[PDB]
């Protein structure tokens, strides 16, 4: 009966008027683009009809792949579409995401991360497991999706049986059409109700203050029943905003209606992410409208439909990943959104009934200053993990490979340089066996190299734990109200040689205290990161076991225990090293960037040479997760990089 | 020589010097250096390093004495030797609050709060309590006192009063009045306690007599504020004393 009630709802989606037209294009054409606004039914209805196509084909049942850029999106829509097909999740409908695979030999529709299908492509280059592959929400132009577009453009020349469907929510289809050999376009019209677009008369000076004020005013003064969507840039900013919105409504007294604030970000567990599908609170007995406000990152910008939303609040910002290849820095920065994003944001209002979008900037600024399209992630990311995946795909010509928006050649030079000096490439540039193993790890190349090479330093059990703690959110919960108690608990685990060994101490103590939720609270340790780290470690070890990489430990009483770990770190991060200059600042190797130790380190002093996991570009340059290294290890472990003929004087 | 040259490193050098003497087989000389270290140290940070190293040394020799007495057969002096080292380790941990407090007193002898905490550790041991009051009165400069000096005097008199040694407490109060404290309010509060003591014991005529001497005018018509005058002289104006 639940299936039939889902069926009644799904038949009203805009795509269903185009099912026959969809099927007509899909059978006759190899590639095509499908454009439809968010909520038209794309992610839920289109792969089910591909299952209908793939079930009627004769022979062995190949699956349907549908990519999702976002882990949170991929899991939740897989659950939803299992409910739409009246099957159990992980049976005929499953999901596969980075560090978590919920699939089986029955899986004929798998919603997956881009960076897992691309990794499956590294092991199945023609993607023979799938008869239809669906590139969904491709207007986000994520780093692994852009690679998958080119891989499928190769495979379609070799596999006339594979169908490729590129799904978008933006009018930038012309780029997607021309790139897939002038393939057809299926445009699904909106059935979004009208969205009124409001602008401020002048530009607001504090967009966070403006965001909080606009959220409260809508809740008190708007007579339409409806949920709120506040867009913000990330976790820490949402958490302070959620505290502020709480205080500023609590001071308004009992007459204001109840507001249901729900965070939605990627580091939340699945059970807490699933809470967004709960109904809004009811209207109070005094007539005050009960509303839900979802205060989300850009994970809610695509793939998701929150029913009942009427009022959208758009500050216009998000966090984007940026890479600066001239200085080899990767960072997350807050950037302005595109007009395309701002239209998609506004079109969330019109989903359940007519609605309003309150843009906190002038209408003049909207016309002339906002960018038309969002920049592709490949134009702003380190290609080192991608080039490692690309070389594993048999893509040798990285210069003339058909990227839809090609990266800067210098950025490609940095990806080749990084892999050459790591001995993942030789001096001719071919992919070594070491690189081929590194690509299979769902890690950055520095992290992948460090896990593999640590086997020879007899400390691969510890480095795998460090890498897992680095592949997950930072493990020290440091609440603003509780900093003193959190630091004093953190200093119980602080290792003198730095953060990597401090993460090791936290992880060992976590495993020694039998994964205790209470112990995590009492020591301000992120239980969810640690369970994710344990999940990360148990799967990377299964990759290590697959490549026979020996899990080794050094004697804990030996002086060389921590020293060997510190040497093993150098094997992957020798490019991410800084020297302590005589004036007490650090200078990064080759790129000569002036940096400081990040204020979350345990290092209270400055070693002459420090290795760092992450460069943190802010109002000052910081290096984060730092460890003391000795300079006589650099010339012995990496002579090609530390050749003093070409190395700058530092 | 290094200990004179490297003035900041001392606790580490003592432990390295003790280590040399451990390897020399002069285990007693290691203990000599660690107590010498504890005596010289003037930070809790250095003290922690010395304490932890000495305890590990004590632990290792206690375990060694247990094993050797079982292997060699227990001579009476050998079994007593083990009991001594344990009791020295019992002394070490019990001395540790007193030593910790003493280190802060090495940093500031004027630290009246640490004097109260020292007496608080001495509790149940009257002679130690009596002596540390006397040491507090001698060491603390009123003009540098962190924590007001009369609070020592009140507790000093109260302890004798709790012991019923009222005439000794009076002598303490008499000595207290001789002190020229940093502020008139310190001496005034003492004069109150002189009165209040007699009120508890209902010696009301003596209370009056004390306050008559307290209020008693200088031959000058002295100001309440003139710091060149003795603190005893200034008390004659005091609001508290007259109101009482």
């Amino acid at each position: 009966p639940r299936y039939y009630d889902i069926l009644k709802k799904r038949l009203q989606l805009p795509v269903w008027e185009y099912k026959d037209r969809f099927t007509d294009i899909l059978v006759r054409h190899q590639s095509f683009v499908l454009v439809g606004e968010t909520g038209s039914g794309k992610t839920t209805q289109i792969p089910q009809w591909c299952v209908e196509y793939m079930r009627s084909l004769p022979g062995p049942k190949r699956g349907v792949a549908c990519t999702q850029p976002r882990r949170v999106a991929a899991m939740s829509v897989a659950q939803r579409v299992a409910d739409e097909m009246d099957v159990m999740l992980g049976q005929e409908v499953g999901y596969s995401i980075r560090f978590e695979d919920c699939s089986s030999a029955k899986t004929i529709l798998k919603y997956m991360t881009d960076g897992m299908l691309l990794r499956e492509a590294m092991n199945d280059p023609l993607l023979e497991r799938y008869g239809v592959i669906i590139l969904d929400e491709a207007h986000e132009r994520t780093l692994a999706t852009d690679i998958l577009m080119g891989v499928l453009k190769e495979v379609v020349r070799q596999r006339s049986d594979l169908k490729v469907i590129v799904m978008s929510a933006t009018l930038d289809a012309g780029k997607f059409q021309i790139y897939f050999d002038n393939c057809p376009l299926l445009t699904i019209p909106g059935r979004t109700h009208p969205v009124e677009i409001f602008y401020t008369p002048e530009p607001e000076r504090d967009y966070l203050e403006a965001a909080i004020r606009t959220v409260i005013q809508i809740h008190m003064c708007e007579e339409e029943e409806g949920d709120l969507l506040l867009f913000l840039t990330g976790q820490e900013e949402i958490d302070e905003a959620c505290k502020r919105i709480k205080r500023e409504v609590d001071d308004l007294g009992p007459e204001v209606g109840d507001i249901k604030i729900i965070p939605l970000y990627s580091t939340l567990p699945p059970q807490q992410q699933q809470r967004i599908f709960e109904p809004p609170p009811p209207k109070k007995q005094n007539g005050a409208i009960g509303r839900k406000v979802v205060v989300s990152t850009n994970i809610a910008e695509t793939s998701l439909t929150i029913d009942g939303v009427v009022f959208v609040i758009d500050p216009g910002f998000a966090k984007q990943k940026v890479y600066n290849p001239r200085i080899r820095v990767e960072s997350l920065l807050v950037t302005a959104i595109s007009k395309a994003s701002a239209q998609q944001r506004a079109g969330r209002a019109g989903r359940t009934r007519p609605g309003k979008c309150f843009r906190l900037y002038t209408e003049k600024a909207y016309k002339t200053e906002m960018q038309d399209n969002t920049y592709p992630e490949i134009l702003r990311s380190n290609l080192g993990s991608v080039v490692l995946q690309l070389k594993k795909l048999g893509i040798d010509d990285l210069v003339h490979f058909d990227f839809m928006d090609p990266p800067a050649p210098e950025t490609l030079m940095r990806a080749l340089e990084l892999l050459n000096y790591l001995a993942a490439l030789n001096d001719d540039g071919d992919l070594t066996e070491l690189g081929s193993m590194m690509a299979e790890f769902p890690l950055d190349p520095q992290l992948a190299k460090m896990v593999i090479a640590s086997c020879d330093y007899n400390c691969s059990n510890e480095v795998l734990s460090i890498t897992a703690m680095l592949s997950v959110p930072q493990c020290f919960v440091r609440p603003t109200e509780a900093k003193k108690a959190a630091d004093e608990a953190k200093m119980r685990f602080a290792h003198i040689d730095g953060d990597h060994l401090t993460l090791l101490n936290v992880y060992h103590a976590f495993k020694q205290n039998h994964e205790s939720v209470q112990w995590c609270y009492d020591n301000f340790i992120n239980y969810r990161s640690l369970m994710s780290a344990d999940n990360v470690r148990q799967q990377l070890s299964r990759i290590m076991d697959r490549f026979n990489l020996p899990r080794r430990s050094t004697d804990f009483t030996s002086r060389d225990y921590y020293i060997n770990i510190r040497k093993a770190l150098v094997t992957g991060y020798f490019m991410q090293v800084a020297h302590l200059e005589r004036t007490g600042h650090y200078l990064t190797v080759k790129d000569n960037q002036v940096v400081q130790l990040h204020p979350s380190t345990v290092l209270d002093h400055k070693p002459e040479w420090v290795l760092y996991n992450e460069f943190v570009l802010t109002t000052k340059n910081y290096i984060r997760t730092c460890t003391d290294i000795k300079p006589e290890w650099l010339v012995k472990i990496a002579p090609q990089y530390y050749d003093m003929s070409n190395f700058p004087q530092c | 020589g290094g200990l004179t040259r490297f003035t900041d490193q001392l606790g580490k050098l003592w432990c390295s010097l003790a280590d040399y003497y451990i390897r020399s087989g002069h285990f007693e000389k290691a203990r000599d250096v660690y107590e010498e270290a504890i005596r010289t140290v003037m930070t809790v940070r250095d003290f922690t390093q010395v304490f932890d190293s000495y305890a590990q040394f004590e632990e290792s020799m206690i375990a060694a004495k247990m094993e050797t007495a079982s292997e060699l057969g227990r001579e009476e002096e050998d079994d007593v030797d083990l009991e001594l080292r344990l009791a020295r380790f019992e002394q070490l941990i019990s001395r540790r609050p007193l030593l910790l407090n003493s280190v802060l007193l090495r940093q500031n002898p004027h630290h009246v709060h640490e004097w109260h905490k020292r007496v608080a550790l001495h509790q149940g041991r009257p002679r130690e309590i009596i002596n540390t009051y006397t040491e507090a009165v001698q060491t603390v400069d009123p003009f540098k006192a962190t924590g007001k000096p009369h609070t020592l005097w009140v507790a000093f008199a109260k302890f004798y009063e709790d012991n019923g040694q009222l005439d000794d407490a009076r002598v303490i109060l008499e000595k207290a009045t001789k002190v020229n404290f940093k502020q008139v309010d310190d001496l005034a509060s003492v004069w109150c306690q002189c009165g209040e003591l007699e009120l508890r014991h209902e010696n009301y005529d003596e209370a009056l007599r004390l306050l008559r001497k307290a209020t008693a005018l200088p031959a000058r018509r002295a100001e309440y504020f003139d710091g060149s005058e003795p603190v005893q002289n200034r008390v004659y104006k005091s609001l508290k004393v007259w109101s009482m």
Binding site: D604 | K12, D19, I22, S24, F27, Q49, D52, S53, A64
Partner: peptide, 25 residues
């Protein structure tokens, strides 16, 4: 830390010192 560096170094060194010390004594 400068202070803690000597703490970790000497903790391992004291155990070596106790081991060689019992042999010498």
């Amino acid at each position: 830390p400068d202070y803690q560096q000597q703490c970790h170094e000497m903790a391992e060194r004291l155990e070596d010192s106790v081991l060689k010390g019992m042999q010498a004594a």
